[PDB]
Write a protein that binds this ligand. Structure first.
Ligand SMILES: [Zn+2]
Ligand SMILES: [Zn+2]
Lengths: 184, 63, 33, 129, 42, 19, 147, 150, 25, 81, 28
RNA sequence: AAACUAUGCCGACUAGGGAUCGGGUGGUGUUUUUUUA
């Protein structure tokens, strides 16, 4: 079901994870039907600066709602399939540029499709299923910003070994340097 | 050569004439202005409201 | 109690000072410019 | 009711400094307020500040040691050329080289010394000495 | 004599503009319309 | 708490019942 | 001590080795007097972090409830230090147990700004944001004299 | 500071930081939209609809469980009111006080309170005419009030 | 990894406590 | 409590304060799962509700509204979350 | 004192310990 | 018929202390009472 799982993206890593998808389906009693109406768009494998690696799955939004419904044990099983990886589900969302002073008839940009809202949805998706409890931006005297994201302390050991990976993948996706933190 | 007093410093701040500039403009000659130690201590003793007048008085041309 | 509250030194001798900040009249704008 | 967001912020910084605290809570923030605090901080009047995001409009907690004398805001934002920059510094600040007049140029928000260096001008937000 | 019902209230200036119906027009259209009302009063 | 005159369809049926 | 506590050498123009617990800036350092290879540093997220240099790593961190302006080791005992701290207090910590303070010096009405030990290891001076100077002994926990 | 009075009361609702459904919410957005439509056909106001949805059915906030707010969903499905609820209730109170005066012509306190209610009505109607949800010729008077609220 | 750094810092703490305990004696 | 920070106030004081004057304002209320004995049936109830929540299957009064917090009726097995 | 007379389990927290939010490495 | 010995610096305002009036949250026992209010 390689071409039946992919959506116009022939890449060998996507073929490998789609074969993994087939393994979880035809080895699972109910999760086969639970993931059968769910395809995805794209895969990427990105390293952290420390040498570890993570997979990021670009997914459209309704099947992303499905993945949020079915995610956690599927992430566990895909971790068992790609041992020594970090599983990531994200959304390939559409940005809309600012229409210039000399620009033809385009549609007035939805604030959901303004850039920063995309990045905040990206934060929530990347951090999911643990929630964000706050954001701080400390301005140091040399003119040095520090962006800080305070998460929750319910999934504390479930997430405590993911933070440098999260920093690396978010910086590689957006181009911001950010720091996560979990207030004990 | 001209001795300065605290009231002179304060009213010069409140009417915006720099000490050396305005003093040269008055006499039309060059003026060496001198703060004495008791005047500097009067300013420091006036304290936290008049500290900007103290910081004007601590100037490298006020011998 | 009888003596008056001693005021500091008055610097910004151009405009009125209210809660909104300094208000400068066009008269004073033209005077200084 | 409310004077302005910028007038309230700079007013609260004056009052908390002169009473003698170490950190001030400013609400609500603004890009003008972030840039104004950045200018004052670079020239060494306040300590350092932290922007708290809470989905309404953030607060700012600013640590300030002792170096502020007054910070304010001009209400009618008039226009200046460069000779006017010199004349307005001479009439606003307590002395010639004492304190900075904070402008809004076409090159951003910055003080009168940097505006004279970059050779631009604009309008005038406030002043700090 | 006393009446228990209050008299009406004078309307605001923007309310008078909306009552005239001018408030939703462009600058040139409201300019020529203001000229028209001044001429017809005149 | 059934405000029978609140909505446009309800006042349309009110106009019908006047007719 | 900046945004990251770097360790430099006089001969080398580059920072030789950086230490940082996380990405939190650092506003005061002191090397201790005896057993010279132990450093301590305060941190702007109201913390105190001890470092060791002969193993080239930060070693322990205690997060307090108000930020600590300035610390100082004592020269006659080599594992006790004082932190002048913004809740109007000085604190006298051991290095081993960082779960209790050996003392808390308690006589200022504003933020204590700096603290220094007598070289006899007996008394303490704290100068505060309040416009005065307290002198304490390291036994009492209350002021001895005010300047 | 609570206009047409003096009190300085702060008493409202907080709004949580999170902009997503709670983890205990296992109800479909289509189901709760159908629920809102059924309540509107039953004949409640948007505010009481949200009140019923957070009391009985555990919908924390309709704006965050479904992308659109309650009045937006009602306008989407054709349940648009003719005047918004706060203007409706203000005109209702104006009719109430006016009828009480008619039965009791001595209540100068009710005369003063009716003056204040009329002022609030004028402010709200002017804003709604500005946004042009109301027609620019919408005048409030006693016959319009009686025929619209009865 | 980071929990390896955490365990490493715990070990360095025990070493430092030993040396400082000599100074205690 | 004698002197406290602004950026990092301890969870004691950030629970002792108001709900609006805290650092980041969030609600004090919560949600309950009650089980009515009329059908042994589970309903989700706001802890500050205003209407007499009646179960769907049996016409049974779960909670009555009283000022701030709703009072639940006797013999109705409830737990948080 | 009043809260101690009416509350069941309040602990007495020492003055040398009222100011420590927490340590990283804990003790036995 | 009224008034007839009253008089407090103010403000864009910092910490508060004892009270008390109205509402709410929690703890805690006395006063209460219990399938009928
Ligand atoms: Zn002398
Ligand atoms: Zn039931």
């Amino acid at each position: 079901p390689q071409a039946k799982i992919l959506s116009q993206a022939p890449t060998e890593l996507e073929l490998q994870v789609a074969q993994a998808f087939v393994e979880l389906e035809n080895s699972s009693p109910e999760l086969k039907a639970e993931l059968r109406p769910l395809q995805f768009k794209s895969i990427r494998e990105i390293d952290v600066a420390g040498g570890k690696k993570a997979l990021a799955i670009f997914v459209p939004v309704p099947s992303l709602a499905g993945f949020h419904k079915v995610q956690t044990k599927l992430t566990r099983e895909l971790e068992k399939k790609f041992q020594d990886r970090h599983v990531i589900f994200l959304a390939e969302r559409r940005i809309l540029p600012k229409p210039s002073r000399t620009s033809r008839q385009v549609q007035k940009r939805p604030r959901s499709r303004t850039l920063t809202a995309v990045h905040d949805k990206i934060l929530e998706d990347l951090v999911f299923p643990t929630e964000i409890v706050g954001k701080r931006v400390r301005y140091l005297v040399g003119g040095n910003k520090i962006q800080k994201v305070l998460l929750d302390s319910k999934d504390v050991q479930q997430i405590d070994y993911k933070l440098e990976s999260f920093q690396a993948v978010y910086n590689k996706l957006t181009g911001k340097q950010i720091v996560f933190e979990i207030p004990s | 050569q001209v001795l300065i007093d605290t009231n002179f410093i304060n009213f010069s701040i409140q009417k915006k004439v720099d000490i050396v500039r305005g003093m040269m403009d008055c006499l039309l000659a060059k003026c060496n202005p001198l703060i004495t130690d008791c005047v500097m201590a009067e300013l420091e003793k006036l304290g936290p409201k008049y500290r900007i007048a103290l910081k004007l008085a601590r100037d490298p041309r006020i011998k | 109690k009888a003596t008056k509250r001693e005021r500091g030194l008055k610097i910004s001798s151009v405009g009125r000072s209210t809660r909104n900040g300094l208000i400068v009249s066009k008269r004073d704008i033209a005077r200084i410019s | 009711t409310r004077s302005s967001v910028l007038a309230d912020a700079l007013n609260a910084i004056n009052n908390a400094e002169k009473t003698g605290k170490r950190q001030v809570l400013i609400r609500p923030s603004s890009k003008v307020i972030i840039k104004f605090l950045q200018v004052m901080q670079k020239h060494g009047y306040i300590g350092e500040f932290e922007y708290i995001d809470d989905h309404r409009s953030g607060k700012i907690v600013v640590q300030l040691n002792g170096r502020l004398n007054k910070c304010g805001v001009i209400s009618p934002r008039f226009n200046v050329k460069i000779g006017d920059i010199e004349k307005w510094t001479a009439n606003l600040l307590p002395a010639r080289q004492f304190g900075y007049v904070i402008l809004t140029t076409s090159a951003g928000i910055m003080d009168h010394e940097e505006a004279r260096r970059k050779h631009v001008s604009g309008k005038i937000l406030g002043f700090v000495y | 004599v006393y009446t228990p019902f209050p008299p009406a209230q004078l309307p605001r200036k923007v309310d008078l503009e909306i009552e005239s119906g001018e408030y939703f027009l462009s600058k040139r259209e409201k300019q020529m319309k203001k000229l028209n009302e001044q001429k017809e009063k005149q | 708490k059934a405000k029978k005159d609140f909505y446009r369809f309800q006042v349309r049926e009110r106009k019908k019942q006047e007719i | 001590g900046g945004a990251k506590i770097h360790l430099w050498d006089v001969n080398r123009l580059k920072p030789v080795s950086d230490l940082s617990w996380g990405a939190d800036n650092i506003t005061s350092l002191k090397f201790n007097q005896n057993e010279t290879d132990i450093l301590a540093s305060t941190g702007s997220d109201n913390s105190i972090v001890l470092y060791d240099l002969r193993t080239n790593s930060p070693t322990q961190k205690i997060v307090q409830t108000m930020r600590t302006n300035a610390i100082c080791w004592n020269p006659m005992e080599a594992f006790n230090f004082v932190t002048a701290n913004e809740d109007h207090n000085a604190y006298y910590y051991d290095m081993r147990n960082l779960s209790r303070s050996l003392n808390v010096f308690k006589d200022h009405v504003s933020a204590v700004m700096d603290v220094d030990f007598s070289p006899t290891g007996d008394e303490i001076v704290t100068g505060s944001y309040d416009k005065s100077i307290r002198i304490y002994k390291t036994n009492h926990g209350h002021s001895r004299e005010i300047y | 500071g609570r206009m047409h009075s003096a009190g300085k009361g702060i008493s409202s609702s907080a709004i949580p930081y999170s902009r997503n459904a709670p983890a205990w919410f296992k109800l479909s957005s289509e189901s709760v939209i159908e629920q809102i439509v059924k309540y509107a056909r039953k004949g409640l106001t948007p505010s009481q609809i949200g009140v019923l949805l957070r009391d009985a059915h555990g919908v924390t906030q309709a704006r965050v469980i479904t992308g659109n707010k309650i009045m937006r969903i009602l306008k989407s499905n054709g349940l648009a009111p003719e005047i918004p609820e706060d203007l409706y209730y203000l005109i209702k109170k104006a009719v109430s006080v006016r009828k009480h005066l008619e039965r009791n012509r001595k209540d100068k306190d009710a005369k003063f309170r009716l003056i204040l209610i009329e002022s609030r009505i004028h402010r709200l109607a002017r804003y709604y005419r500005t946004v042009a949800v109301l027609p620019p010729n919408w005048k409030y008077e006693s016959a319009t009030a009686s025929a619209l609220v009865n | 990894q980071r929990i390896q750094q955490r365990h490493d810092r715990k070990a360095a703490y025990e070493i430092s406590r030993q040396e400082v305990s000599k100074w205690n004696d | 409590v004698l002197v406290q920070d602004l950026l990092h106030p301890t969870a004691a004081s950030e629970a002792r304060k108001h709900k609006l004057k805290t650092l980041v304002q969030g609600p004090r209320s919560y949600f309950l799962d009650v089980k009515c004995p009329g059908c042994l049936n589970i309903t989700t109830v706001f802890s500050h509700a205003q209407t007499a929540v009646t179960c769907e299957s049996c016409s049974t009064i779960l909670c009555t509204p009283t000022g701030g917090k709703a009072k639940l009726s006797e013999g109705t097995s409830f737990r948080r979350k | 004192a009043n809260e101690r007379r009416t509350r069941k389990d309040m602990p007495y927290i020492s003055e040398r310990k009222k100011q420590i939010v927490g340590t990283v490495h804990k003790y036995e």
